Chains A and B, each alone.
Chain A
């Protein structure tokens, strides 16, 4: 799964194609802002407020 070179393009064509699709099109995480720390403070622990 990690080294897709190990999947034979001749013996296993479909499985190789399915592996490279996952690596290139899986969704990318992102971030957004919320809250008002001036009054409510911040309760975040492992992330920035």
Chain B
């Protein structure tokens, strides 16, 4: 019925409507996975892992 958020995902401060999440847990998990993949590639574009590894 609910989920606890660790870090990251500790910066959700706006209304739930703006995020527009799916209702069911499995759908929400999927939705979050595809949305986080794009952000990962976006940050890796700026910071290559071979230079900023540590």
Interface digits, A1-23 against B, CB 8 Å rule (1 contact, 0 not)? 00101100011000000000000
- A16 to B: closest C-beta gap in Å: 13
Category for how many chain B residues contact A: under 10
Count of chain A residues with Cβ under 8 Å from any Cβ of B? 5
Identify the B interface with A (CB < 8 A): 20, 38, 42
The residues of A that contact B20 with a CB separation of less than 8 Å are 10-11
**Which residues in window 1-49 of A have CB below 8 A to B?**
3, 5-6, 10-11
Interface of A is mostly: loop
Across the interface, B38 reaches (CB within 8 A) one of A5, A10, A11, namely A5
The residues of A that contact B38 with a CB separation of less than 8 Å are 5-6
